[PDB]
Amino acid sequence: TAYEEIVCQVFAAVLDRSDVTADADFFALGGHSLLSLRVVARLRALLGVDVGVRDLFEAPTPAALAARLTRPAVTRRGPDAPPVLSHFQRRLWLIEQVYQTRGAYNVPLAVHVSDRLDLDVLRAAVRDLVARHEVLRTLVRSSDDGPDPVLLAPEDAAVDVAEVQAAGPVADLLAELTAQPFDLATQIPLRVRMITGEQVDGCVLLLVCHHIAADEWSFAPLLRDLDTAYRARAAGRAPDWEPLPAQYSDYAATLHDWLGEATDPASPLRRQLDYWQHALQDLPDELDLPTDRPRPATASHRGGLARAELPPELVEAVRRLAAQHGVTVFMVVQAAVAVLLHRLGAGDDIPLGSPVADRADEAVHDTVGFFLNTLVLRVNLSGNPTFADLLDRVRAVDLEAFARADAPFDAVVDTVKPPRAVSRHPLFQTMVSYQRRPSDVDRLFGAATRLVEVPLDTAKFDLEFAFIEDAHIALNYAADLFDHDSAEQLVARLRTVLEHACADPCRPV
Numbered sequence: 001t002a003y004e005e006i007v008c009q010v011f012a013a014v015l016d017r018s019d020v021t022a023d024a025d026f027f028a029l030g031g032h033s034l035l036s037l038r039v040v041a042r043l044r045a046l047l048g049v050d051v052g053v054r055d056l057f058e059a060p061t062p063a064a065l066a067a068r069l070t071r072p073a074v075t076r077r078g079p080d081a082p083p084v085l086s087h088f089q090r091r092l093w094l095i096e097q098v099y100q101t102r103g104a105y106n107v108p109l110a111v112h113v114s115d116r117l118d119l120d121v122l123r124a125a126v127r128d129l130v131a132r133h134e135v136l137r138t139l140v141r142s143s144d145d146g147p148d149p150v151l152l153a154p155e156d157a158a159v160d161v162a163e164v165q166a167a168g169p170v171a172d173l174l175a176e177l178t179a180q181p182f183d184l185a186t187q188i189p190l191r192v193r194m195i196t197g198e199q200v201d202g203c204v205l206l207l208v209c210h211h212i213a214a215d216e217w218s219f220a221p222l223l224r225d226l227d228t229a230y231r232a233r234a235a236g237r238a239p240d241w242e243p244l245p246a247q248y249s250d251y252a253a254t255l256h257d258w259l260g261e262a263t264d265p266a267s268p269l270r271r272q273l274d275y276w277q278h279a280l281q282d283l284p285d286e287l288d289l290p291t292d293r294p295r296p297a298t299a300s301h302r303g304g305l306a307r308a309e310l311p312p313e314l315v316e317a318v319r320r321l322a323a324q325h326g327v328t329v330f331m332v333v334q335a336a337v338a339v340l341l342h343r344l345g346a347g348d349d350i351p352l353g354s355p356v357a358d359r360a361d362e363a364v365h366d367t368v369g370f371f372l373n374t375l376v377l378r379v380n381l382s383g384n385p386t387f388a389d390l391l392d393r394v395r396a397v398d399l400e401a402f403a404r405a406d407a408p409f410d411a412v413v414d415t416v417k418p419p420r421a422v423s424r425h426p427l428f429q430t431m432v433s434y435q436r437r438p439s440d441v442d443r444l445f446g447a448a449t450r451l452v453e454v455p456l457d458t459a460k461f462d463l464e465f466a467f468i469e470d471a472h473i474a475l476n477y478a479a480d481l482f483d484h485d486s487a488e489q490l491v492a493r494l495r496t497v498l499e500h501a502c503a504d505p506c507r508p509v
């Protein structure tokens with residue numbers, strides 16, 4: 001996606017357009033060939049990989065050209081193929097065995113529908129959705145060897161759909177309903193609740209998935225498929241879609257077969273693991289941050305959410321600054337957080353974790369599942385560099401780390417073998433992420449729909465900064481270490497670093 005977004009930068013800058021999308025065709029937007037010499041030339045200076053007009057012909061779209069610049073394609077297995085637990089799923093199942101997460105790993109998705117949907121038709125749509133995505137009806141029961149996936153049959157996957165009347169503010173009820181625990185060995189990792197009442201106009205459709213079966217990118221497939229299925233089941237027929245290109249097990253199986261054994265030196269896993277053992281060498285145990293309380297001895301996993309609204313001219317300024325320096329918006333937001341901690345006394349070694357989506361294959365681009373590997377983006381701020389300088393360091397660190405994004409985070413932790421503490425997250429405690437909410441989801445289920453935020457009562461790490469476009473900043477802080485007022489000031493201080501950065505990126509940090 002980093003390669004993907006940076007290619008759009010050159011397409012729009014060379015073709016002088018604003019019609020640059022992930023699925024846009026270079027030649028289709030008026031693209032010739034000297035234009036490719038300029039586009040191919042610029043791509044070399046930023047990404048540093050060998051690109052040529054030859055690549056542009058084969059991959060004339062940013063999405064394709066990005067995948068071309070960088071492993072077998074996901075091959076759909078047999079109809080009777082058994083489920084296969086991906087290394088991503090193993091971590092999520094494992095985390096809930098070692099921690100009292102309080103549902104901190106339940107990802108919520110709430111939509112406001114102008115019409116109180118038909119709970120019976122909705123249920124049929126939820127049953128259809130679960131049947132389409134095997135990941136939504138796959139249980140993880142513990143055994144003597146390890147966790148074993150149990151793919152429920154469509155007839156046997158008891159879906160959980162129910163209506164819920166709102167008494168108080170639905171915002172706090174959504175958080176409460178979302179944080180309810182999941183029993184991955186007996187319950188499917190999908191929960192649907194239709195919140196209705198006299199205080200809410202129409203109803204609020206809440207989809208609560210456990211992260212083991214869905215990530216933030218699965219929101220679009222879920223809503224799109226639940227709309228497609230809901231509309232059909234409302235007409236007495238089964239929803240008419242074309243079969244899924246692949247299932248999660250197919251992606252996991254193809255991914256695991258290619259990853260190889262960490263003991264074989266020629267396998268991608270060990271060869272990537274080796275990069276990280278060097279890249280994360282002599283890593284800080286933890287950053288010297290300003291906390292309001294000492295690190296507890298138990299991970300309460302409880303936290304809050306401090307938001308900082310971003311003016312359109314500031315969102316527009318950040319995008320402009322990114323394009324000028326040949327860096328993604330994430331890299332800008334990441335440098336801001338790094339500077340913030342650096343200015344707060346963290347030091348010159350700012351290890352920030354970040355989620356990278358493994359959705360390169362076209363067979364899993366719009367599929368439901370968890371493809372987010374956590375990566376340690378180690379930013380060095382020594383030598384009192386300017387912001388534009390740190391944008392160079394960040395980009396190099398990111399692109400270099402993005403080429404080794406397939407080593408499971410848990411394996412990197414085992415390879416770097418860091419001093420551990422159940423109250424502290426390994427390698428990193430501050431996470432920076434850039435999310436985008438689904439667009440064109442305003443007329444779902446034949447009504448007036450609109451996404452609703454769920455107030456987070458939990459926190460996965462000490463500090464999680466999130467740049468969320470519809471844009472704003474969301475601070476997921478650990479309640480055991482930070483006070484809400486302190487988080488509000490910290491997210492606001494991030495905004496001020498961004499304001500100064502765009503205005504004068506030549507200023508020391």
Ligand SMILES: *P(=O)(O)OCC(C)(C)[C@@H](O)C(=O)NCCC(=O)NCCSCCO
Pocket residue numbers: 032033034053
């Ligand atoms: P611009 O759009 O005007 O430039 C177009 C170029 C020069 C890139 C190219 O499309 C062109 O004009 N001709 C390319 C045809 C060609 O000769 N390809 C070589 C492969 S043919 C087999 C050789 O063994």
